[model samples]
Every structure is written in C-alpha cells, then in structure tokens.
Target: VDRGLASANVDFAFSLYKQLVLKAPDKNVIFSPLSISTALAFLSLGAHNTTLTEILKGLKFNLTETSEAEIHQSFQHLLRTLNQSSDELQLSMGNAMFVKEQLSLLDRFTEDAKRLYGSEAFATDFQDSAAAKKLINDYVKNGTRGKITDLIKDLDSQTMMVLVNYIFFKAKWEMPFDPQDTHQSRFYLSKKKWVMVPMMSLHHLTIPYFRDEELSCTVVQLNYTGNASALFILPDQDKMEEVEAMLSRETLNRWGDSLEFREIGELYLPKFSISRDYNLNDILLQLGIEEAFTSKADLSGITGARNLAVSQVVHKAVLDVFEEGTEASARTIVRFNRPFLMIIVDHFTWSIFFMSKVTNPKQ
Candidate 1:
C-alpha cells in the first residue's frame, strides 16, 4: 500500500513481462500480467507454508514486510479500484476456482477467497474431465463477456482443482485516427523483408511523446475515457532487443514522469486485432515457482491436506484497436511506421492489461 511496496510489485510485473518478451522476440506476444497475478493471488489464498511464500514472492510481494492478510487486502483494494467502469470503457477483472466434489475445502479459506479476491467457488466432478473443463471454459467466457473463450482444456481425471482468471479491456484512442485515413502500407519484417497491411494514420494530433535516443526508442501515450491509457514504445530498427533489455519499472516510471504534451506531425499504427493463449506452467516454473506444481507441494490451506497441486495455468486475451477518439496531448512529431512494443496500462492499479511486440503487422 505504501509507495515502496507498490513499486516492488510493479517491478515484478515488468520483470515478468521481460521474461515473456524473451520467450518470443520475433513474434507478437500479448498477455495480461494483472490477470496472471490475480489468478496467482487466488492460488496464494489456499497456499500454505512455502506454497504461499512462492506464490507471493513470485508475484513480487515481500512477505517479511507485509502480512498475509495485508497482501490479500491489497488485492481487495485493487479489485474495487479497477472494476469501476463508465459507459465509454469496458474493463473488468475476475477469477473462479473449480473444485472436485470429492474434495473437502476449508470453510474459512472459501469465505476469505470469496471476500478478498471476489472469486466464485464451484463444485464439479473432475472424474468427468470433459464436463469439468467445459464448465471452467464457459465460466471464463461469460466472465469476460465472451471476449475470451475456451480458456481451460484437457482436464486430467486426478485433478482436484482448477483456477482461472480473465480480463477484458476496451477503450477509444483519445485522438482517434480516422477510419477513412487507413490504407495499406509497407511494414518491415526485418532489415530486408516487408509486408503490406492496413495501417491507421492520423495527422496534426497532440499527445504525450518522448524520444529516448539512449534506448533508441520513441515512447507515446494514448488516453482513454477514464484512469487508463496505452503506451506505445517503438524501437528503432534492430533496437528492440536493446530497449527490452533496459525495460524496468523505473524506466517506465521515468517515462511516465517525464511525459510532456506536444504536437505531432504524423502517426501511423497498423490496424490489427490479435488473440493469444499461453500455458504458463513452464513460465511460472522458470520464474522460480516450483513448489506449487510438484508433488511435495504444501497447499493445505485449501483442504487442510497436501493433496492439491496446480495442473495447469491457461491465459487467453484479445485486443482490438479501432477508430474511437476522446482527447489527448503530444509534443513534436511521433509516429509508429515500424515494428514496436505496445502496452495498455491501468493508471489506478499501475498494472498492465495488454503487452505485445508487433513485428509483421500482418493480422
């Protein structure tokens, strides 16, 4: 809740973002760190001993300085803070846990899970793995208002519980590029490769802009109706690797702190919508979250027994950027005529809704 702790968690998400970026440098990568962390936070509630520690620490929470109850309270605060939406924007975060009917979970744990994370507890038959998977996938689909679907799959008969989370974010660009101005343009695939795609263009617009020559990148911010915005970081040719290597909470904080309103000469963003799914079991393990997945794991807080271990983590996300405008500010001329990185940032939670690396621009 303090500035220091908030910075730590933001750093953790950005650090995790870097790991995801390293996993795929050449292709587009889009996933919600806030959704992933919230799902893990739901897991932490039922975790005991090292299980709780690993989940929290992996999420960049320092247990020494923060109590378990305090950490849970922070999520309660974040949920209430982020769920407030006006008519102009559609932003929601939610989670649910599917448990086998045979398992007996702690009543207090269930109550706290519902209260803290606002998660719904459902009893299902894991023996009928197909039905159980369908139930979870359907819950996620409806929770995200159908923006996400088929989030859970291939359930194992021995599974005792499955946790799922979803986030749906849609906001108009403050200075919308006119749909009429959109035209097929050349986008670089690499030094020698290029492709034609429908690129959205706008001229004589004002928005927050920054050019960091040291990182060889141009950073710009696009506002939404409420306390949300998108940051577009376009790196110079062959400079994405260098810019991503230097990415951190401090770097982003500085960028945010240094932004100044200025005028723009031209702006172009490829008109593309993308959907992606990630099985984060390996990625979580790679991030030093091992105890939750192994047989030796201790998750007794859920069922008062060490029988529960995470089977899989499925995350699905979709993003659409079209011609919708409100208002914004810019300095000088900032344009995205090449491949770059983009992040939809939540100002209230200081979290990321969507992050991607646009390479080919071919939908």
Candidate 2:
C-alpha cells in the first residue's frame, strides 16, 4: 500500500482501538486491526455499488479520490509483503471463504478471492451447520497454532457464506532479560492500591527511546532479531487518558522519527501474556460500516442473486512477551512498574500488529 493509504488504515485502527479500550477500560486488550481490515477488504471485492462504497469509506479509504482497481492492487501488495515469514519473527495470516454448496458464486469473485487474497473457496452443506462450523473453526485453530479455539459458537442453515481470518506472531527480544534477575514487584492499580507481579529487571543497557514532555510519557523501542520491534509507553502518573486521546498515525510516525539510542542504568517490565476475543460487528458499525449488513447491501457481485449479507464478524488474537535474546529500556533512566501501553510493530513498515494495556498482569 502507498504511504497515504497505509496512514489512513492506521488512523482507522487507532480510532477503533480507542473505542475498544473505552468499552473495557479495566480489562487487558489484544487484537489485530490488520487482520480485521484484511478480511473485510476481501469481502469488498465482491460488493457492488453502494455496498462497496460504504465498506471502503468506513475503512477510511477515499473511493472518490482513488480508483477501485488501485485499491484492490494495494491489498494484493500488502498481503504479499506481510506474509514473507522469517525465523526471527513468525508472522502469518490466513483467509478463506465457505459458501453454501447449493449456491453458485460468481466466477470473477471466486478467482479474485484466491489470486489476490490467497483465500481458498470451499463449498459445504450449511444445512448440516454444526459439521460445517467445526470444519471452519478447525482450520482457523490449526492456522493459529491452537492459540485460538472455538472461534465461532453457532451456525445457521440460511448462512450463504462465511468469511474468516487469523493472525499469529511470535518473536524473541533482541536482548533477553535474565530469569534469575526477575523478582516479584509492586504494580500500582491506583494511588492507594497495588499488587505483586513478576518484573524483569535490567541494568546498564542502551535502547531506542524518547521523552515526550507534552504527553508526559517516555516511549522506548525494543528490537527483535528480524528487524521487528515493540514499543512501550510509560505515562506520567494519572496521565493515561490524556495520552490515549492523542494516539494517531502522526503520533506514531513522530515517535518513530524522534527515538534515539540512550543509556539506561535501571529498567523493569512485567512479564505478561494476553489472549482476546471480540464480536466486531457492533464496533465496525459504530465506525460507519452499516450497509453491508442491511437488506440494501449489494453483495450481488458475489452471486448473481442478492441473497448474501454479512451476519457476523469475529476476531481472536494472542501476544506473549517473555525472556529470549542477547539483553534490551529508558531515557537516562526509566521503569514500566505502573500502568502502561505496549505495541508490537513492524519497524520496516511501522504497522502495529498487537497492542495491550497492562493494569493487572494476573488478569
């Protein structure tokens, strides 16, 4: 994707992130905006007239400004670029469509699904909904290496088509924290409350960091073996809400451009893992994606008859941060022993794959 398009997608992601964070302010969050966008983009290929326009516009794509053909080409480029996995960062994405065996889909749609999105089409008997549901969920489970299970609960016989996607990422730090040096430490949930958690401690290390006086937050970037990296944001006491309001593509770009290598005497980060599941239909609609679900949806591009309408959108993700590499924190001195936000991003493209806010690691 071009710089402008990529920026638009990231902006949409952050906007959606703010909504999700507010919906569950006290719980941990971890999901792939990229995965959700990819699945919908594939659906857009078969959408016609206003149906296509609405989805593209809701995704922050300016259809009037950019050609539809050009938009599809960009998705092709994006999928090809992100799928090239390496030993250092195991990043993978899978897309597939299940159509009712009795219904015949348009040939153009089926071809594009496979060629552009790498999605395979399967014809199944939706009448036997349970068996078909299991077939689809099992494929997703295998693709995500079993990190996600039972992704969908129920399937209806009237379902015309089911679209699904999954994302999985695993990487070791460029510099690993020592297990022996890790000790249980206090993490404050509020001014008068706290809990003991395992904190990975480091001493005398150099890392990429920047101090944002305006936001009252210190940002640090940690590199993985294959040029991937994660950024940690430690906001000043009671400044989390203020910082989250400013999150945007421009803010991330500024952080990336401003970070510099600085020596740190002491730093500590909690060792935590998070898995999250979300029913994104409501959230996407809140972002102005509505026509696809209503009777007005022009999914005729998928089949000659306008019988297909999206019933639901489901997403699942997993993120595990642990000790693994050589050693990697802070301005001159910094610590993440308070409430903070974490992001796993591709340094090469500056695209965020996973995001989390740790209020309590035990949660």
* Residues 1-363 of candidate 2: C-alpha lDDT, one tens digit per residue: 346557767877787788788789867777887777777888888888888887888778876678668878887887777667576777766677777788677787889888888876677788988898889888778765455668877888888677777777767787788888888998888867998988887888899989999889999988888768889999998999898898887888898899998888888888777778787778878888888888877888777777777776777777777666322221367878788888777755556677778777777
Q: Which stretches of candidate 1 lie over 4 Å from their true place?
A: 1-5, 144-149, 325-333
Task: Give the distance in Å from residue 306's predicted Cα in candidate 1 to where it truly belongs.
Answer: 1.8
| Clash total of candidate 2 | 3
Q: Kindly list the per-residue Cα lDDT of model 1 for residues 79-194, writing each as its tens digit.
A: 76666667577765567777778777778888988878888667779897888887787776775544455777678898866677666666776667777888888888877888
TM-score of each: 0.92, 0.92
Give Cα-based local distance difference scores for all models.
0.76, 0.78
Worst 10 residues of 2 by lDDT: 323-332
